[PDB]
Amino acid sequence: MKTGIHPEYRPVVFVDTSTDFKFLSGSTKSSSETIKWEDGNEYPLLRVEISSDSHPFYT
Amino acid sequence: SNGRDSESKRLGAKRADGQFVTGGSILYRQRGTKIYPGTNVGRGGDDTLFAKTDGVVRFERMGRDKKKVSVYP
Amino acid sequence: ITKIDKNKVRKKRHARVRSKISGTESRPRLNVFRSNKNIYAQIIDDVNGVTLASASNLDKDFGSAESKVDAASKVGELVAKRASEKGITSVTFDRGGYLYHGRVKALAEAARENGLEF
Amino acid sequence: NRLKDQYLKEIVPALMSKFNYDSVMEVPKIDKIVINTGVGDATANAKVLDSAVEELALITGQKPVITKAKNSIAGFRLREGMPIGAKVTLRGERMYDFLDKLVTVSLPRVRDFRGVSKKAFDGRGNYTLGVREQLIFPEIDYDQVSKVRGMDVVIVTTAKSDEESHELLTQLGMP
Amino acid sequence: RVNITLECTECGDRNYITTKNKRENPERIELKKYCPRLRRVTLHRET
Amino acid sequence: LVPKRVKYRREFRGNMRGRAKGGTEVAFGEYGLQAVEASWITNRQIEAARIAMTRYMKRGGKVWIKIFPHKSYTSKPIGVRMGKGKGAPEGWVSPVKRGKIMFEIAGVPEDVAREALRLAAHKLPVKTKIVKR
RNA sequence: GUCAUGGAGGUAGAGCACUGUUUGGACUAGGGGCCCUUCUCGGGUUACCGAAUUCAGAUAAACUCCGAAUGCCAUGUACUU
RNA sequence: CUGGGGCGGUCGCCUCCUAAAGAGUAACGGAGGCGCCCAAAGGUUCCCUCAGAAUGGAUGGAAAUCAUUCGCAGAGUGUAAAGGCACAAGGGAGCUUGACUGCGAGACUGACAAGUCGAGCAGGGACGAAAGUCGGGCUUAGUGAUCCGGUGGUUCCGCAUGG
RNA sequence: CUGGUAGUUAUGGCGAGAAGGUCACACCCGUUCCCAUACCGAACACGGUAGUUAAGCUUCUCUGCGCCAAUGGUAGUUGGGGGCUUCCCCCUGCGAGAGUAGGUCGCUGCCGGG
Ligand SMILES: [K+]
Ligand SMILES: [Mg+2]
Ligand SMILES: [Mg+2]
Ligand SMILES: [Mg+2]
Ligand SMILES: [Mg+2]
Ligand SMILES: [Mg+2]
Ligand SMILES: [Mg+2]
Ligand SMILES: [Mg+2]
Ligand SMILES: [Mg+2]
């Protein structure tokens, strides 16, 4: 993996407002927000539009 | 509207198989590699095959479909 | 999907090297095979078809090392040693198709230091 | 992450007992996930390509290599070379960070999807995911770039038979 | 496309003639040719 | 019968030495008209012979034309001296070597076949023999 | 000059592996005829065309998977001249 | 030149067929090209494989790009054609200017004038770890003598001597 | 016995089926270091050996594809003769291509480990 070419690969937690569950998945755009789960390994947080697990059709 | 043609380029073999040649003797004139350089033979810039040393000229097969000319002292 | 065989394409590169590099009775070919675990060297007369000297990593007669590059330096040392013993001075270095960088290089470097003239 | 480990825990034995393989090496595993765009309106103006080279760089994580035309057709108005479409491949511990998104955040913004869309398989044993627009993903949003362009997502598997691939995608998570 | 003569800076003569396309290469071409007067390589520049 | 296109508009007359290399055994029909001696068969002769065969059969049974006129031939007009390059293409011929089955017919009784073929043979510049499979 | 041995070379013939020319089946695509609940979007037929596809069969100065006879170049410690 | 002459056409060079399996071989015989181009489209190191079809996928249509399988070349090779070329001579990238100076055993071709190939030697380099390759380009067209002028250089001559 | 490396016009190749595995070979696990991707530890490189013969790899069987291939006959043809000369025939030597009987799932050398 080259350096000083691509944007950050840093991990970040994604959370849905409805179901309210947390999971780790690395992506761009951190935004820098605190989390509850895994308090030791601090990661950013992003607000997410309604997920699949919440919606009963896809579930 | 025809009537044209280039000079013939006297291509083909210039020394026989089993013939003693001096170093630098042209063996074969050709466009491309009809025949490939063997041992002690070089390919000129126009594909002319020539003896790098004195010796006897030998045309051999070099694998089913191809052919080469060597010079053994 | 199909996974390309490294050795098959390796040997296709080797062909490209052997194109310009042949062993003679005066100057033979230092051929290097490299496996995931160990590495081997041969010194070959391509006019006759006979190997004169051969070092390797899995030899009970001297084969202690730390890293695979270090190990390959030790094999390079032995091949150079055993070559001088036989009475070979000047060799041409066949990469076998491996890129001259990591091991294969350190094998060559370490061999060139001892009694060998690339 | 939580998916690759979950592949090695509860997807390797069970699945194998369904088809009954000899070794655990035939076990259909995913290789590379290749996402390209293909900007038809690139030859005229290149800023729409820059936006395509910006969006993928916020979706995947690694910048895309710009793909150059192969032959020349006059109908579409194309000439030898010319940058037309971008492409990016995912392999390792960055790739299984691009299937969870599709399991979580991609599907619901799409209207309907009848489980595993059986029509979108080659048969040789690789999947292509039909992607309408870019707003399906959660990083870019529709308040940065002007036009959507579109996307096209391929997923390559070790699977030999299409059925030995269909029964993998589901168990991973993606319907 | 035109015939060009490369003048050596030291050599003090222009024995190297060449050619270029003066549309694609309008600038004066510099090449490190062997100068046989000084018997070494010297920068030669188009006149 | 004319080639749809040709690589070369002009072509050597060639020669007609030897037995035809192929098409010496009736292969489609029951009866065939075999050339006994060599000759150029022009497309105008092939058409003449075809209609003569066909009319006598009354849209009954099949007719294979086993020869095709591949070779153009040129001419010079009257009142034109030799030279000034090759003349313009006139027509199309099939060099028929001896033993070449030129026409074949099936789906009519022997007598009608044998009659159809003699009518055909009278339009051709070559000595013919009626042969059967 | 002949014998022996070696060799370069694509003609005659032949062949269809390529390139062009070409006949008859069989095979589906399609479009065009033909009827059409139809927006000729989709069906049902066709022998009116059709571009592939295979099966069988032809053809070539500027085709060749092949390939002579001769001729040519050499070599010999061969026999003549 | 000319199947009388004129009119028309042609005039030098390259490729093919004619050309009869070495070379050569005519016609106002059959077909085409040339009077350039390229600072990389040259050198070298390293790495690579094309066309097309099937199948699945947003704008995307028969045909753009992506993925898979089948693919000895059905592609490519600056430019005609022939002969070559996948160890590629085809395609990438890095560094470069050997598209070097002095030459050149020896051959090919040729009535001559000319034309062509060339190991190797020296000088000094490029690339390469080395081996080595490099005196332009896959090969074969892209040219025109002498005389007379012009410009540059010069341990040459300089009409008594120095100029 | 298997790894490496040559030679030999594919009788050696392809395709199909089967068996085998720390004795190497391999895939395989990782990206800290040298080194990589016109993006990607895929490749290249480097460090490991938990896991596996599934693939490549090696050995064994098969003639479906290819490949090799007689004998005989024919075509053609050097030389010598004839005709009824778009061509044809006879004598002597040479003698294809196609097709066929058949052959082939290689042979051969060196080096290391077993
Ligand atoms: K008649
Ligand atoms: Mg001529
Ligand atoms: Mg040249
Ligand atoms: Mg013939
Ligand atoms: Mg011919
Ligand atoms: Mg006249
Ligand atoms: Mg007259
Ligand atoms: Mg000749
Ligand atoms: Mg004076």
Side-chain angles (χ1 to χ4, degrees):
Chain A
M1 181 66 83
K2 295 185 179 183
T3 183
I5 302 292
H6 338 78
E8 70 288 356
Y9 294 69
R10 64 183 296 119
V12 45
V13 176
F14 281 63
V15 293
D16 188 7
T17 191
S18 58
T19 193
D20 191 3
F21 288 123
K22 311 193 170 60
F23 69 105
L24 191 74
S25 185
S27 182
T28 62
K29 194 180 71 62
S30 57
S31 307
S32 304
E33 291 291 354
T34 191
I35 59 176
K36 188 172 66 61
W37 181 61
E38 192 74 293
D39 57 353
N41 302 0
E42 182 61 57
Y43 300 122
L45 188 71
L46 292 177
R47 188 60 55 115
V48 185
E49 190 268 2
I50 55 172
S51 178
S52 300
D53 57 355
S54 183
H55 201 296
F57 172 60
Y58 301 110
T59 303
Chain B
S1 287
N2 314 303
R4 297 178 299 293
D5 194 3
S6 54
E7 262 62 5
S8 313
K9 292 308 189 291
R10 285 93 172 134
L11 300 192
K14 303 302 197 194
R15 290 288 183 285
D17 174 302
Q19 183 173 15
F20 188 69
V21 300
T22 57
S25 300
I26 292 174
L27 299 190
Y28 210 76
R29 292 278 201 182
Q30 62 182 351
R31 302 280 82 96
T33 58
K34 293 196 86 284
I35 309 187
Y36 280 78
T39 174
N40 293 324
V41 164
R43 179 175 153 228
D46 68 353
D47 311 298
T48 304
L49 303 180
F50 63 94
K52 277 161 62 60
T53 56
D54 295 14
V56 176
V57 175
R58 294 296 175 189
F59 291 86
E60 307 92 354
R61 194 176 62 264
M62 63 174 324
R64 194 167 193 101
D65 55 356
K66 281 171 168 47
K67 196 181 285 201
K68 63 168 183 180
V69 68
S70 289
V71 173
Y72 303 105
Chain C
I1 190 170
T2 62
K3 291 185 177 62
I4 60 183
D5 182 15
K6 293 188 181 67
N7 195 20
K8 272 187 177 182
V9 299
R10 200 276 291 178
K11 211 65 186 62
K12 196 175 186 301
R13 278 199 294 279
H14 191 192
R16 174 165 52 236
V17 169
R18 288 298 318 295
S19 185
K20 296 195 292 187
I21 297 162
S22 57
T24 313
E25 292 184 2
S26 307
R27 192 184 194 123
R29 166 172 59 115
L30 183 71
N31 198 154
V32 171
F33 176 61
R34 188 201 65 185
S35 65
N36 294 349
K37 208 159 64 64
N38 30 8
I39 188 174
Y40 317 67
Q42 299 186 15
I43 293 174
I44 323 186
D45 270 347
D46 288 353
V47 67
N48 292 352
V50 281
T51 303
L52 282 63
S54 57
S56 292
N57 193 183
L58 61 92
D59 284 351
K60 280 69 66 176
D61 202 19
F62 174 64
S64 56
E66 301 77 3
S67 183
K68 297 195 295 191
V69 296
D70 299 2
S73 307
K74 308 291 276 290
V75 186
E77 194 181 1
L78 188 68
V79 58
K81 189 185 175 181
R82 290 196 192 175
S84 183
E85 290 284 0
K86 191 65 61 171
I88 309 304
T89 308
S90 210
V91 288
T92 324
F93 181 60
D94 169 10
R95 297 182 297 124
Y98 304 116
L99 204 79
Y100 184 101
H101 165 244
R103 288 195 274 166
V104 288
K105 175 158 165 292
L107 194 171
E109 256 60 5
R112 175 148 45 194
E113 290 291 353
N114 295 189
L116 271 194
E117 300 179 1
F118 300 146
Chain D
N1 52 349
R2 61 163 288 289
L3 216 186
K4 188 185 74 63
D5 193 5
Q6 182 263 346
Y7 177 51
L8 196 72
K9 284 291 180 63
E10 63 179 5
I11 302 184
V12 161
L15 186 78
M16 170 171 91
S17 301
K18 188 181 293 184
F19 299 119
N20 189 6
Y21 299 114
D22 298 2
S23 297
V24 306
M25 273 302 202
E26 290 187 344
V27 165
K29 69 188 298 180
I30 323 175
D31 281 7
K32 67 178 177 294
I33 304 181
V34 189
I35 310 79
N36 69 309
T37 313
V39 177
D41 191 3
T43 182
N45 195 358
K47 187 170 64 60
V48 174
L49 211 186
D50 189 8
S51 60
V53 176
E54 188 68 7
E55 59 186 6
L56 295 179
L58 296 182
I59 286 188
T60 62
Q62 67 196 248
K63 72 177 292 186
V65 65
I66 305 174
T67 66
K68 309 170 76 285
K70 189 169 288 184
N71 297 357
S72 186
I73 294 85
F76 307 138
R77 190 172 50 65
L78 190 75
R79 189 173 60 244
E80 278 70 5
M82 290 198 333
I84 178 175
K87 173 261 283 187
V88 68
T89 68
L90 287 121
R91 310 169 183 276
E93 295 185 359
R94 223 303 182 244
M95 168 175 72
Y96 300 124
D97 287 0
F98 185 61
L99 287 181
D100 198 354
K101 308 296 180 185
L102 297 176
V103 161
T104 306
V105 188
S106 188
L107 288 177
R109 300 181 81 120
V110 188
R111 314 312 174 187
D112 54 353
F113 187 56
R114 185 190 175 185
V116 183
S117 179
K118 183 56 62 273
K119 188 167 62 61
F121 272 119
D122 57 356
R124 193 62 273 290
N126 289 358
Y127 185 62
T128 59
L129 180 72
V131 171
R132 287 287 96 75
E133 298 183 358
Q134 50 162 184
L135 68 101
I136 66 178
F137 219 68
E139 271 52 285
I140 193 65
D141 279 307
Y142 190 58
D143 57 359
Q144 296 291 354
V145 185
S146 58
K147 188 178 184 300
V148 304
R149 285 316 306 175
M151 269 194 322
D152 201 13
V153 170
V154 173
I155 322 180
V156 186
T157 53
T158 311
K160 298 297 181 183
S161 183
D162 191 7
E163 295 290 355
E164 299 181 0
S165 197
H166 165 48
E167 294 287 359
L168 195 74
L169 289 184
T170 311
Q171 287 189 180
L172 287 172
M174 171 270 207
Chain E
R1 168 156 298 262
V2 293
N3 290 348
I4 288 311
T5 190
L6 303 187
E7 192 174 4
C8 180
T9 62
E10 305 168 6
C11 223
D13 56 352
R14 41 270 196 71
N15 288 7
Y16 287 111
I17 68 161
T18 59
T19 174
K20 69 178 184 175
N21 193 343
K22 71 174 178 62
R23 278 69 83 171
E24 267 59 7
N25 292 18
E27 69 285 354
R28 306 215 308 215
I29 281 62
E30 299 177 1
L31 290 173
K32 294 157 59 58
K33 305 295 291 176
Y34 175 84
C35 160
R37 192 181 301 249
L38 307 182
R39 309 244 305 302
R40 77 178 166 264
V41 176
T42 311
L43 192 79
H44 295 55
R45 175 180 304 109
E46 168 183 347
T47 56
Chain F
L1 279 193
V2 185
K4 278 180 276 289
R5 54 174 299 295
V6 294
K7 205 166 43 182
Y8 293 98
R9 270 179 51 251
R10 308 189 168 80
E11 178 176 347
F12 292 162
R13 280 91 173 167
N15 67 76
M16 287 174 300
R17 293 185 286 255
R19 289 184 52 67
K21 46 163 56 176
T24 68
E25 312 301 346
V26 63
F28 299 127
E30 305 169 12
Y31 298 90
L33 189 70
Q34 165 159 65
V36 159
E37 66 197 8
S39 174
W40 274 13
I41 308 289
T42 69
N43 53 358
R44 297 310 82 197
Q45 295 163 2
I46 297 179
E47 191 65 357
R50 187 198 67 71
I51 295 174
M53 279 164 91
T54 296
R55 194 191 302 117
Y56 184 75
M57 280 177 203
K58 283 182 287 293
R59 288 181 59 247
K62 281 210 72 191
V63 174
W64 294 265
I65 307 174
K66 291 285 297 308
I67 56 167
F68 188 94
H70 292 298
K71 170 167 291 169
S72 57
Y73 65 106
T74 64
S75 84
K76 310 294 270 299
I78 287 174
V80 156
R81 297 202 186 130
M82 300 283 100
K84 266 65 87 179
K86 196 158 179 64
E90 250 284 300
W92 306 90
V93 298
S94 183
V96 172
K97 303 194 173 189
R98 57 200 169 71
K100 165 71 78 163
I101 299 191
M102 290 177 311
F103 305 83
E104 292 184 20
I105 62 190
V108 289
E110 184 168 4
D111 54 351
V112 172
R114 280 187 175 288
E115 179 50 30
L117 288 178
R118 78 162 263 284
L119 289 185
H122 272 285
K123 311 291 190 179
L124 297 190
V126 64
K127 267 208 196 295
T128 44
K129 200 259 292 302
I130 294 173
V131 53
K132 62 184 303 186
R133 199 204 278 252

